[model samples]
Target: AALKDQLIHNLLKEEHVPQNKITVVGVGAVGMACAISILMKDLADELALVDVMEDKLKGEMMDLQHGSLFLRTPKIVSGKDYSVTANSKLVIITAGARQQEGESRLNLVQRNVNIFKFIIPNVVKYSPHCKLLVVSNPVDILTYVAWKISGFPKNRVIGSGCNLDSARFRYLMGERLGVHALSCHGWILGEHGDSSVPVWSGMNVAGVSLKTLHPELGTDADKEQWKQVHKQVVDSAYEVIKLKGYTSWAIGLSVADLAESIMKNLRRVHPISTMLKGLYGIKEDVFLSVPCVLGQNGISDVVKVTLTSEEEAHLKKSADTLWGIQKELQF
Candidate 1:
């Protein structure tokens, strides 16, 4: 039977429009976790997987494809070629050298930077307009590298940054207060690593300040215990890595959350990494985690929360530290 003229025209029009496709670069544990999480969340209408390990990439694609009947059933594709990533709305980069036990995220810079040197250009060549969500370690530096390499607008290049760290902050705080984490509102800003600053002044449990609840929160006696929470936030990854060999699920879920905000144009505020060029008294051009409104346009706005003098100083310190590492990079 011949197709009707209207049907053919509709098919052509549909093919010409952009699809809500996402490209994940890497098939490692973390990347796989991200893929699973994104798939489960029903974020993409089409998903593409790219990796150098052709066999593993094919295997992973098949694995997900087999489960498509139960999922939202997005069109799944995989390849070693960048062509597979064409017309992606978002390209999440989770491929990089894993951080070893006892190593800081910044320490993974040079190693991952070299990997991005090849990955970023190819990704950009195929998906030039895709917003880059960098999940690789030393994320801030690597994100800056991706921005420079792709020459995309600063808004289009983002790092997973301290969104995971902030979640940890909320979880730990909720655990301490015996409250559900979703009711706890706060942010861990600046570097995603050791220098990350917890905005205690802004922290609240159901709209009430911790100080109002305890009255002695952050006081000399209570300070030690509260400080330990931030310490745990910084060390949480290391502890998990030391215990399990590597981290995947949490970071995977975190990236998926960030991707959802972008894909759905949710305009949710997440403390992900973006370029800092003068805000927060930071003079150096660096990428660090600050509370940013994320949406289809990428970073729509940066939320400037009130910070105590000490908190502000700490954030600047974190920015300077990241700048030091970023300055020496070859990208």
Candidate 2:
């Protein structure tokens, strides 16, 4: 099948055809926002949209079709049925309950897991070879649930986990240090929630060690300061919820970047959630945030980084926290 796909792909290229196709399941703010980003960035030659709300889904599709006048107009197909999602190269799942005011993301796990049970099968039935990108709340666990139910290889099913969290961390850290967010390199791994671990040992600014320039990272004073920064990163979703009821724009951009890297076969590293399987000595059927090189094959590889003793312990602790939640699986 792999060789067959390669031959088909080569034939398509030889024919000078546009072969990129993507399906986005769910048309909520995040889903539509991501659709806009994907269209604006010209990431797909065809985009299929799926949502349970029939009229709204059609309405969203119509809106995009109308707006496609100026953008790189791809074939925009959408409906309540999975037939519209057939033959997609990648599918992004953004359905399920969202985080509410004063609610922890972990609280939505069971609800989202149930939704995945219904959604994944439908998607796989149509797009069997497609890579799945789980973006619902409590994404790490839901990604695990989707993988378990779909029977896909661990690498092909990924979660938009700490990619957003790490982006927030780097953006905020860059703000504090007066550097552009692009200059800061950091990762927020493990659970995409409060138990998320920040890897200071791996952080750098424009190729320079972040701590070397600040001289306060990991120090007692840095601990106090980071408490606030970490709190801000964790609470960012809620803060946005408090103001706007749901966060969309930045997440849209984040997922668009994920899609772009995969579509272009960029092989860039981003901290997405993939299975452990003995990585970092973890053997559980669990998914969490770790640096993965993204390409046409989804997570092509996981990048290994040396964590300090403290960071290592925190990562393990974070894994245990997610495992505790996974242990409660009833689906």
Candidate 3:
């Protein structure tokens, strides 16, 4: 035991973090998919997978390692040991019980909250300075849970938020307008779940306001169509869950791009869930998805923009919903 302790001390002493040294906890479907996306994007020099399931973790690392040959070589390791995650620059967490077929993201709250209670401290215990990116179901709530438990700076604890949902929103709009999704400008804010707000007042396409380009922006027909689009954004996850028992590939891409924003210190604006207080009159200690600037220092700034009264109310409602659930949690 004494020898083991000395060995661990030396190992910690020698821990070196190259650029993009990321640790991903949980080797579930979403976690492995995220690993592959990060590897394909050449976002890491060293990738570590931490999980309780040893065999599954090893298989995933092996699979990703082989794929690395086609991409930039990234050292991948998998273990039940926290030491494997030492000195990481960023940690993406997808470890928790998944939502059921008919379940809302909120329904998985208690389960994921309990899981993260056991997960976050171990992660921060080793990679104390690493930025944490939470991607578990009910991410808005879990992101708050992680930030509270890890005792990290608020900026470093980010949730995947509505990044994917906004992408889906853009995709739907682009399809309707016959444009590429990337050129469709908008955001889904607030929660990452059912109550998420799509920023319609500020939406644009190729420098043209969506209102001008589509005069029906406020018409009954347009409202119905917009509702349809938002419904797709909200319900598509359940559709995919019913079909495959899990949804991953697109989220894999979402997290990979988000990881890129952090790795490069891009300072790009992304709708990520971060702790909030006194911003737009949200008075509670809660996390909400808002446009935040992502960079090497994690969230360097929180960008405030004009929201229509309705949009603002929607955000407040979303905050209230999360705060209600948060009140039920101990940590």
Candidate 4:
């Protein structure tokens, strides 16, 4: 089976990797868990744990030191000493501001952007050959900032923007359609915030389109609960934020999935936010979630997904919103 082959290949990727690789930065909840997962899952060969607090980074590494006793262990170091990244082949930047109460992810733009100003350039100097995967609040914008500051080729840099958001959307849709998530492919595109749009135009189940999934279902039927499904997906974040303060477990899972794709050379097609080269008739500086193939060198290529006319307009509107931010940043 394909799954069996992938597991074998991933194990080999770990067993035969070169000296230093997959340097995951930061020791935040997401960063720490992702680094831990890479080692636990046999995906990386080294880690360059970074934090403003060296003692904290050291503490986290020591906590995982026992990992070597039962598995392939990786070299671990602390702080922003670029030398540590010198041998790295890929870098996942989860170093940024954590979301706070009553705050939206977009509200993190200025602070996280300032942080990446320092974080990215060092990764460039030492890990110039490594893939750069950006994971920050207001991730799409911060990825653009990282690209601008690092000066790496566009293909080598990306952020996990709507990937997690899209995955979250797909999972919820699967529950409603009574299909497994694997068979439910859809995307939550754009800003990865309150304004994010779901691409319902192209969704289907068992070769039957969503528009036909239930023709009797109208926008206002049953108290308009059908439309509520889409609205519920968009508003789900606040519901969690209210109780949990912020969401992480899902994002952490998505990050590991990204690391596995890069380390194992899967070339898996997934949605991610990357610098746009003028797709969907919207040309300018901005980041939007489009289908992308992430490989050893971050985003290896952007894959064009055929969007229905409605999907196309939604995608363009997504671009237009981010471009609005670009303009505001200018003036």
Q: Which stretches of candidate 4 lie over 4 Å from their true place?
A: 1-20, 215-226, 308-310, 327-331
For candidate 2, what is the TM-score? Answer: 0.91
- State which candidate has the highest lDDT: 1
Q: In candidate 3, what are the lDDT values of residues 1-331, reduced to their tens digit?
A: 7988867655344545566699888888898899888887878889899999888888888877777659784588879988889889999999888888988888888888888888888888888889999999899989888988988889889999988998898998899879899889988888898888877677897677876666776445775566667778889899998998989899999999899999988999999888879987889988988989999889989888888888898889889889999988975
Q: Which stretches of candidate 3 lie over 4 Å from their true place?
A: 1-17, 212-224
User: Candidate 4, TM-score vs. the true structure?
Assistant: 0.85
lDDT of each: 0.89, 0.86, 0.86, 0.74
lDDT order of candidates, top first = 1, 2, 3, 4
On lDDT, the stronger of 2 and 4 is 2
Q: Determine the backbone clash count of candidate 2.
A: 0
lDDT (Cα, 0-100) at 32 in candidate 4: 78
Q: What's model 3's TM-score?
A: 0.92
Error of 4 at 284 (Å): 0.4
Q: How much is 30 displaced in model 4, in angstroms?
A: 1.6
- TM-score of every candidate: 0.93, 0.91, 0.92, 0.85
Clashes counted in candidate 4 amount to 0
Query: Which one wins by TM-score: 1 or 3?
Result: 1
Residue 155, model 4: lDDT of 84
- Backbone clashes for every candidate come to 0, 0, 0, 0
lDDT of 4 by residue, 204-252 (tens): 7666677566653424655436556666666666777789876667777
